[PDB]
Amino acid sequence: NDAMLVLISYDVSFEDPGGQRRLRRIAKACQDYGQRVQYSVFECVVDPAQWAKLKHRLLSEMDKEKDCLRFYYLGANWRNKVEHVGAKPAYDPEGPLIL
Amino acid sequence: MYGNDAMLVLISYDVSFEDPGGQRRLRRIAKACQDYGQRVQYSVFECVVDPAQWAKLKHRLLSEMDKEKDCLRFYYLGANWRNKVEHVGAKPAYDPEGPLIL
Ligand SMILES: [Cl-]
Ligand code: NA
Protein backbone atom coordinates (compact mmCIF):
# COMPACT_ATOMS: atom_id res chain seq x y z
CA ASN A 1 0.00 0.00 0.00
CA ASP A 2 0.95 3.68 -0.03
CA ALA A 3 3.65 4.84 2.35
CA MET A 4 2.42 7.08 5.17
CA LEU A 5 4.20 9.00 7.90
CA VAL A 6 3.83 8.11 11.54
CA LEU A 7 5.18 10.65 14.01
CA ILE A 8 6.23 8.75 17.12
CA SER A 9 6.51 10.50 20.47
CA TYR A 10 8.34 8.36 22.99
CA ASP A 11 7.85 9.79 26.48
CA VAL A 12 10.67 8.09 28.38
CA SER A 13 12.93 9.21 31.24
CA PHE A 14 16.09 8.91 29.19
CA GLU A 15 18.46 10.17 31.88
CA ASP A 16 17.46 7.10 33.91
CA PRO A 17 19.44 3.87 33.28
CA GLY A 18 16.65 1.69 31.85
CA GLY A 19 15.05 4.61 30.01
CA GLN A 20 18.32 5.34 28.23
CA ARG A 21 18.60 1.73 27.06
CA ARG A 22 15.00 1.58 25.87
CA LEU A 23 15.35 4.88 24.02
CA ARG A 24 18.49 3.65 22.28
CA ARG A 25 16.68 0.50 21.13
CA ILE A 26 13.60 2.43 19.94
CA ALA A 27 15.78 5.01 18.14
CA LYS A 28 17.68 2.19 16.43
CA ALA A 29 14.40 0.52 15.37
CA CYS A 30 13.10 3.78 13.87
CA GLN A 31 16.34 5.06 12.37
CA ASP A 32 16.19 3.87 8.77
CA TYR A 33 12.51 4.78 8.24
CA GLY A 34 12.96 8.52 8.52
CA GLN A 35 14.52 11.10 10.80
CA ARG A 36 14.90 11.98 14.45
CA VAL A 37 13.27 15.37 15.03
CA GLN A 38 13.89 15.39 18.81
CA TYR A 39 15.87 13.13 21.09
CA SER A 40 12.75 11.02 21.56
CA VAL A 41 10.52 12.09 18.65
CA PHE A 42 10.82 10.06 15.41
CA GLU A 43 9.35 10.36 11.93
CA CYS A 44 8.84 7.02 10.18
CA VAL A 45 7.66 6.59 6.59
CA VAL A 46 6.15 3.15 6.33
CA ASP A 47 3.96 1.04 4.09
CA PRO A 48 1.44 -1.26 5.79
CA ALA A 49 3.77 -4.26 6.12
CA GLN A 50 6.60 -2.11 7.45
CA TRP A 51 4.35 -0.40 9.97
CA ALA A 52 2.90 -3.65 11.33
CA LYS A 53 6.46 -4.93 11.88
CA LEU A 54 7.80 -1.67 13.29
CA LYS A 55 4.88 -0.99 15.63
CA HIS A 56 5.28 -4.48 17.11
CA ARG A 57 8.98 -3.87 17.78
CA LEU A 58 8.33 -0.53 19.48
CA LEU A 59 5.62 -1.93 21.74
CA SER A 60 7.99 -4.78 22.68
CA GLU A 61 10.86 -2.44 23.57
CA MET A 62 8.95 0.10 25.67
CA ASP A 63 8.09 -0.36 29.31
CA LYS A 64 4.30 0.04 29.28
CA GLU A 65 4.15 0.92 32.97
CA LYS A 66 6.94 3.54 32.95
CA ASP A 67 6.88 4.89 29.39
CA CYS A 68 4.38 5.93 26.83
CA LEU A 69 4.35 5.90 23.06
CA ARG A 70 2.04 8.11 21.08
CA PHE A 71 1.52 7.61 17.38
CA TYR A 72 0.30 10.42 15.12
CA TYR A 73 -0.92 9.18 11.74
CA LEU A 74 -0.17 11.91 9.19
CA GLY A 75 -1.21 9.73 6.25
CA ALA A 76 0.06 9.39 2.70
CA ASN A 77 0.01 13.18 2.22
CA TRP A 78 2.10 14.05 5.26
CA ARG A 79 4.15 16.45 3.14
CA ASN A 80 1.11 18.74 2.89
CA LYS A 81 0.60 18.55 6.69
CA VAL A 82 4.07 19.26 8.11
CA GLU A 83 5.75 22.64 8.43
CA HIS A 84 9.26 23.41 9.63
CA VAL A 85 10.48 26.78 10.94
CA GLY A 86 13.99 27.60 12.11
CA ALA A 87 17.25 25.70 12.47
CA LYS A 88 17.92 22.34 10.86
CA PRO A 89 17.17 19.31 13.05
CA ALA A 90 20.28 18.34 15.04
CA TYR A 91 20.20 14.89 13.46
CA ASP A 92 20.91 14.59 9.72
CA PRO A 93 21.01 18.37 9.08
CA GLU A 94 22.00 17.71 5.46
CA GLY A 95 18.85 15.79 4.58
CA PRO A 96 15.54 17.34 3.57
CA LEU A 97 13.51 19.03 6.29
CA ILE A 98 10.47 16.99 5.25
CA LEU A 99 10.61 13.32 4.19
CA MET B 1 -16.57 22.18 23.68
CA TYR B 2 -14.88 22.66 20.32
CA GLY B 3 -16.46 23.87 17.09
CA ASN B 4 -16.64 21.64 14.03
CA ASP B 5 -13.83 23.74 12.55
CA ALA B 6 -11.44 22.89 15.40
CA MET B 7 -8.30 20.95 14.47
CA LEU B 8 -5.28 19.57 16.28
CA VAL B 9 -1.78 20.84 15.73
CA LEU B 10 1.04 18.76 17.22
CA ILE B 11 3.91 21.17 17.93
CA SER B 12 7.45 19.89 18.29
CA TYR B 13 9.70 22.56 19.79
CA ASP B 14 13.32 21.52 19.32
CA VAL B 15 14.70 24.13 21.70
CA SER B 16 18.37 24.79 22.39
CA PHE B 17 19.63 24.59 25.95
CA GLU B 18 23.02 25.95 24.84
CA ASP B 19 22.34 28.97 27.05
CA PRO B 20 19.72 29.94 29.66
CA GLY B 21 17.52 31.52 26.98
CA GLY B 22 16.31 28.09 25.86
CA GLN B 23 14.49 27.25 29.08
CA ARG B 24 12.98 30.77 29.10
CA ARG B 25 11.66 30.44 25.56
CA LEU B 26 10.32 26.98 26.35
CA ARG B 27 8.47 28.34 29.37
CA ARG B 28 6.84 31.05 27.23
CA ILE B 29 5.92 28.64 24.43
CA ALA B 30 4.53 26.08 26.89
CA LYS B 31 2.43 28.81 28.46
CA ALA B 32 1.02 29.90 25.10
CA CYS B 33 0.16 26.33 24.17
CA GLN B 34 -1.22 25.27 27.55
CA ASP B 35 -4.63 26.93 27.11
CA TYR B 36 -5.40 24.86 24.01
CA GLY B 37 -4.48 21.30 24.92
CA GLN B 38 -1.89 19.21 26.69
CA ARG B 39 1.84 18.77 27.01
CA VAL B 40 2.83 15.28 25.84
CA GLN B 41 6.59 15.75 26.28
CA TYR B 42 8.73 18.43 27.86
CA SER B 43 8.74 20.25 24.50
CA VAL B 44 5.93 18.58 22.53
CA PHE B 45 2.49 20.17 22.69
CA GLU B 46 -0.99 19.39 21.44
CA CYS B 47 -3.24 22.34 20.63
CA VAL B 48 -6.86 22.17 19.53
CA VAL B 49 -7.59 25.43 17.75
CA ASP B 50 -9.93 26.88 15.17
CA PRO B 51 -8.47 28.88 12.26
CA ALA B 52 -8.53 32.27 14.00
CA GLN B 53 -7.08 30.87 17.22
CA TRP B 54 -4.32 29.09 15.33
CA ALA B 55 -3.35 32.22 13.39
CA LYS B 56 -2.83 34.08 16.68
CA LEU B 57 -1.09 31.24 18.47
CA LYS B 58 1.22 30.46 15.57
CA HIS B 59 2.27 34.10 15.36
CA ARG B 60 3.05 34.09 19.08
CA LEU B 61 5.11 30.89 18.91
CA LEU B 62 7.14 32.14 15.95
CA SER B 63 7.80 35.41 17.79
CA GLU B 64 8.96 33.68 21.00
CA MET B 65 11.29 31.13 19.36
CA ASP B 66 14.85 31.89 18.32
CA LYS B 67 14.87 31.03 14.63
CA GLU B 68 18.65 30.57 14.53
CA LYS B 69 18.97 28.32 17.60
CA ASP B 70 15.61 26.54 17.74
CA CYS B 71 13.19 24.83 15.45
CA LEU B 72 9.41 24.49 15.54
CA ARG B 73 7.67 21.79 13.56
CA PHE B 74 3.92 21.80 13.15
CA TYR B 75 2.02 18.61 12.35
CA TYR B 76 -1.51 19.28 11.12
CA LEU B 77 -3.70 16.38 12.27
CA GLY B 78 -6.91 18.04 11.06
CA ALA B 79 -10.46 18.05 12.34
CA ASN B 80 -10.44 14.26 12.76
CA TRP B 81 -7.32 14.08 14.90
CA ARG B 82 -9.08 11.69 17.28
CA ASN B 83 -9.07 9.01 14.59
CA LYS B 84 -5.35 9.65 13.92
CA VAL B 85 -3.76 9.55 17.40
CA GLU B 86 -3.02 6.41 19.44
CA HIS B 87 -1.64 6.23 22.96
CA VAL B 88 0.09 3.26 24.59
CA GLY B 89 1.40 3.10 28.15
CA ALA B 90 1.60 5.50 31.08
CA LYS B 91 -0.40 8.72 31.31
CA PRO B 92 1.37 11.97 30.40
CA ALA B 93 3.02 13.63 33.42
CA TYR B 94 1.45 16.97 32.54
CA ASP B 95 -2.33 16.68 32.98
CA PRO B 96 -2.27 12.98 33.98
CA GLU B 97 -5.97 13.09 34.93
CA GLY B 98 -7.45 14.39 31.68
CA PRO B 99 -8.32 12.27 28.66
CA LEU B 100 -5.43 10.71 26.78
CA ILE B 101 -6.77 12.23 23.56
CA LEU B 102 -8.33 15.71 23.34
CL1 LIG C 1 15.26 14.39 31.84
NA1 NA D 1 19.39 8.70 27.23
Coordinates of N, CA and C in Angstrom, one line a residue, chain A residues 5-88:
Chain A
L5 N 3.3 8.6 6.8 CA 4.2 9.0 7.9 C 3.5 8.8 9.2
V6 N 4.3 8.2 10.1 CA 3.8 8.1 11.5 C 4.8 8.9 12.3
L7 N 4.3 9.9 13.1 CA 5.2 10.7 14.0 C 5.0 10.0 15.4
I8 N 6.2 9.6 15.9 CA 6.2 8.8 17.1 C 6.8 9.6 18.2
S9 N 6.1 9.8 19.3 CA 6.5 10.5 20.5 C 6.7 9.5 21.6
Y10 N 8.0 9.3 22.0 CA 8.3 8.4 23.0 C 8.7 9.1 24.3
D11 N 7.7 9.1 25.2 CA 7.9 9.8 26.5 C 8.5 8.8 27.4
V12 N 9.8 9.0 27.6 CA 10.7 8.1 28.4 C 11.6 8.9 29.2
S13 N 11.9 8.5 30.4 CA 12.9 9.2 31.2 C 14.3 8.7 30.8
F14 N 14.9 9.4 29.9 CA 16.1 8.9 29.2 C 17.3 9.0 30.1
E15 N 17.3 10.0 31.0 CA 18.5 10.2 31.9 C 18.5 9.1 33.0
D16 N 17.5 8.3 33.0 CA 17.5 7.1 33.9 C 18.1 5.9 33.2
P17 N 18.7 5.0 33.9 CA 19.4 3.9 33.3 C 18.6 3.0 32.3
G18 N 17.5 2.4 32.7 CA 16.7 1.7 31.9 C 16.1 2.5 30.7
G19 N 15.6 3.7 31.0 CA 15.0 4.6 30.0 C 16.0 4.9 28.9
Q20 N 17.3 5.1 29.2 CA 18.3 5.3 28.2 C 18.5 4.1 27.3
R21 N 18.5 2.9 27.9 CA 18.6 1.7 27.1 C 17.4 1.6 26.1
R22 N 16.2 1.8 26.7 CA 15.0 1.6 25.9 C 14.9 2.6 24.8
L23 N 15.3 3.8 25.0 CA 15.3 4.9 24.0 C 16.3 4.5 22.9
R24 N 17.5 4.0 23.3 CA 18.5 3.6 22.3 C 17.9 2.6 21.3
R25 N 17.3 1.6 21.9 CA 16.7 0.5 21.1 C 15.6 1.0 20.2
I26 N 14.7 1.9 20.7 CA 13.6 2.4 19.9 C 14.1 3.3 18.8
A27 N 15.1 4.2 19.2 CA 15.8 5.0 18.1 C 16.4 4.2 17.0
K28 N 17.1 3.1 17.4 CA 17.7 2.2 16.4 C 16.6 1.6 15.5
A29 N 15.5 1.1 16.1 CA 14.4 0.5 15.4 C 13.8 1.5 14.4
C30 N 13.7 2.8 14.7 CA 13.1 3.8 13.9 C 14.0 4.4 12.8
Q31 N 15.3 4.2 13.1 CA 16.3 5.1 12.4 C 16.2 5.1 10.8
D32 N 16.1 3.9 10.2 CA 16.2 3.9 8.8 C 14.9 4.1 8.1
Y33 N 13.8 4.4 8.8 CA 12.5 4.8 8.2 C 12.3 6.3 8.1
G34 N 13.2 7.1 8.6 CA 13.0 8.5 8.5 C 14.0 9.3 9.2
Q35 N 13.6 10.2 10.1 CA 14.5 11.1 10.8 C 14.1 11.4 12.2
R36 N 15.1 11.8 13.0 CA 14.9 12.0 14.5 C 14.7 13.5 14.7
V37 N 13.5 13.9 15.0 CA 13.3 15.4 15.0 C 13.4 15.9 16.4
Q38 N 13.4 15.1 17.5 CA 13.9 15.4 18.8 C 14.6 14.1 19.3
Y39 N 15.2 14.3 20.5 CA 15.9 13.1 21.1 C 15.0 11.9 21.2
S40 N 13.7 12.1 21.5 CA 12.7 11.0 21.6 C 11.5 11.3 20.8
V41 N 11.6 11.9 19.6 CA 10.5 12.1 18.7 C 11.0 11.7 17.3
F42 N 10.4 10.7 16.6 CA 10.8 10.1 15.4 C 9.8 10.2 14.3
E43 N 10.2 10.5 13.1 CA 9.3 10.4 11.9 C 9.7 9.1 11.2
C44 N 8.7 8.3 10.9 CA 8.8 7.0 10.2 C 7.9 6.9 9.0
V45 N 8.5 6.8 7.8 CA 7.7 6.6 6.6 C 7.6 5.1 6.3
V46 N 6.4 4.6 6.3 CA 6.2 3.1 6.3 C 5.0 2.8 5.5
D47 N 5.1 1.7 4.7 CA 4.0 1.0 4.1 C 3.3 0.1 5.1
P48 N 2.2 -0.5 4.8 CA 1.4 -1.3 5.8 C 2.2 -2.4 6.4
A49 N 3.0 -3.1 5.6 CA 3.8 -4.3 6.1 C 4.9 -3.8 7.0
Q50 N 5.6 -2.7 6.6 CA 6.6 -2.1 7.4 C 6.0 -1.6 8.8
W51 N 4.9 -1.0 8.7 CA 4.3 -0.4 10.0 C 3.9 -1.5 10.9
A52 N 3.3 -2.6 10.4 CA 2.9 -3.6 11.3 C 4.1 -4.2 12.1
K53 N 5.2 -4.4 11.3 CA 6.5 -4.9 11.9 C 7.1 -3.9 12.9
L54 N 7.2 -2.7 12.5 CA 7.8 -1.7 13.3 C 7.0 -1.4 14.6
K55 N 5.7 -1.3 14.5 CA 4.9 -1.0 15.6 C 5.1 -2.1 16.7
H56 N 5.1 -3.3 16.2 CA 5.3 -4.5 17.1 C 6.6 -4.4 17.9
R57 N 7.7 -4.0 17.1 CA 9.0 -3.9 17.8 C 9.0 -2.8 18.9
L58 N 8.4 -1.6 18.5 CA 8.3 -0.5 19.5 C 7.6 -0.9 20.7
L59 N 6.4 -1.5 20.6 CA 5.6 -1.9 21.7 C 6.4 -3.0 22.6
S60 N 7.2 -3.8 22.0 CA 8.0 -4.8 22.7 C 9.1 -4.2 23.5
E61 N 9.7 -3.1 23.0 CA 10.9 -2.4 23.6 C 10.5 -1.5 24.7
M62 N 9.4 -0.9 24.6 CA 9.0 0.1 25.7 C 8.6 -0.6 27.0
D63 N 8.6 0.1 28.1 CA 8.1 -0.4 29.3 C 6.7 0.3 29.4
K64 N 5.7 -0.5 29.4 CA 4.3 0.0 29.3 C 3.9 0.7 30.6
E65 N 4.5 0.3 31.7 CA 4.1 0.9 33.0 C 4.9 2.3 33.2
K66 N 6.1 2.4 32.7 CA 6.9 3.5 32.9 C 6.9 4.5 31.8
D67 N 6.7 4.1 30.6 CA 6.9 4.9 29.4 C 5.6 5.1 28.7
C68 N 5.5 6.0 27.7 CA 4.4 5.9 26.8 C 4.8 6.3 25.4
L69 N 4.1 5.7 24.5 CA 4.3 5.9 23.1 C 3.0 6.5 22.5
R70 N 3.2 7.5 21.8 CA 2.0 8.1 21.1 C 2.4 8.1 19.6
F71 N 1.4 7.7 18.8 CA 1.5 7.6 17.4 C 0.5 8.6 16.8
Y72 N 1.1 9.4 15.9 CA 0.3 10.4 15.1 C 0.4 10.0 13.6
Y73 N -0.8 9.7 13.1 CA -0.9 9.2 11.7 C -1.2 10.3 10.7
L74 N -0.1 10.8 10.1 CA -0.2 11.9 9.2 C -0.6 11.5 7.8
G75 N -0.7 10.2 7.5 CA -1.2 9.7 6.2 C -0.2 9.8 5.1
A76 N -0.8 9.5 3.9 CA 0.1 9.4 2.7 C 0.5 10.8 2.2
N77 N -0.3 11.8 2.6 CA 0.0 13.2 2.2 C 0.6 14.0 3.4
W78 N 1.4 13.4 4.2 CA 2.1 14.1 5.3 C 2.8 15.3 4.8
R79 N 3.4 15.3 3.6 CA 4.1 16.5 3.1 C 3.3 17.7 3.1
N80 N 2.0 17.6 2.9 CA 1.1 18.7 2.9 C 0.6 19.1 4.3
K81 N 1.1 18.4 5.3 CA 0.6 18.5 6.7 C 1.7 18.7 7.7
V82 N 2.9 19.0 7.2 CA 4.1 19.3 8.1 C 4.7 20.6 7.7
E83 N 5.1 21.4 8.7 CA 5.8 22.6 8.4 C 6.9 22.8 9.4
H84 N 8.1 23.2 8.8 CA 9.3 23.4 9.6 C 9.7 24.9 9.6
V85 N 10.0 25.4 10.8 CA 10.5 26.8 10.9 C 11.7 26.8 11.8
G86 N 12.8 27.4 11.3 CA 14.0 27.6 12.1 C 15.1 26.7 11.7
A87 N 16.0 26.4 12.7 CA 17.2 25.7 12.5 C 17.0 24.3 12.0
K88 N 18.0 23.7 11.3 CA 17.9 22.3 10.9 C 17.9 21.4 12.1

